[PDB]
């Protein structure tokens, strides 16, 4: 059954920090915002590198979490993906094209493709979901924010000419946006976004880093799980959660408070090294790797996340973020 759909009582154990920047000439300050899949015993991770100079991305793989820190990084600026600003990836296999997509931000909502996740040198130069630039609704409501944190999820409707692919994004100004196109058209044809949730009075309650997952075998009110990062007390990052019966439906809070979050300081036990009070910008490690973003909740979720020493005092892009893991 769905023994790991934990309702309003999610509980986790965190590892210590698992992935650090390399001591190399790139002088990366933080490793951030992971996306990951597990295929035949190998974990494939994409993450962002952060320093005051800028953002770009890395790929690495490993078989053992305790050895992840020794995995060589492929710096994706060596692929056609290239130099420039790129951040905050999401990886999935778009089965109808037999291509992996890496969805990320480069100033717009962007994607690269690759037929083989094991060949990081082949990731394409970015192409954008919104060919004319930032949508009007986002430009009109962004204020002093930033258009960030792109997420695709597709429904599993039989007819591809009708099944929808949704692209979510945030503005660091209290809005969550959603566009759609058909499976047949994807990646082309994303509609003008709609605001699907907003918290204008406290923008930090609906900050960024959305994830939308299908729960395998769930056919009713909890078919879809929405996670959004919030900033609480003392700047501690945590995830709020909601559920819905469809991707473009009515979200109902699940575990959505700082005291009872989906994942946060309140419900994460550091059984070993205790190194962060923030559970930030994370993703579930997926074994069902296709564009439906399906989780099998007969098995414990593993959520790879960015954490940071709460006492670090740096410029924001120089924060010493490291990757860690929470497991149910």
Author numbering: -7 to -1, 30 to 350
What's the paper's own text on this?
For the GH62 enzymes of S. thermophilum sequences of Abf62A/Abf62B belongs to subfamily GH62_2, while Abf62C is a member of the GH62_1 subfamily.
The crystal structures of Abf62C in apo form and in complex with xylotriose were determined to 1.23 Å and 1.48 Å resolutions respectively. The Abf62C apo structure was determined using a selenomethionine substituted protein crystal by the single wavelength anomalous diffraction (SAD) method, and it was then used as a search model to determine the structure of the Abf62C-xylotriose complex by the molecular replacement method. Each ‘blade’ in this fold consists of either four (‘blade’ I, II, IV and III) or five (‘blade’ V) β-strands forming antiparallel β-sheets that are interconnected through loops of variable lengths to form a funnel-like structure that encircles the central cavity, which houses the active site. A comparative sequence analysis was undertaken to detect sequence conservation among various members of the two GH62 subfamilies, including structurally characterized representatives from the basidiomycete Ustilago maydis (UmAbf62A) and the ascomycete Podospora anserina (Siguier et al., 2014) points to three completely conserved residues Asp55, Asp171 and Glu230 as the catalytic triad of Abf62C. Interestingly, one of the phosphate molecules present in the Abf62C apo structure is bound in the active site cavity forming a network of hydrogen bonds with side chains of active site residues (Lys54, Arg259, His303 and Gln328) including that of the catalytic Glu230, thus suggesting the probable position of arabinose binding. Surprisingly, despite significant sequence similarity between PaAbf62C and Abf62C enzymes (64% identity) and also the conserved calcium binding residue (H285 in PaAbf62C and His303 in Abf62C), the Abf62C structure does not harbour a calcium ion in its active site.
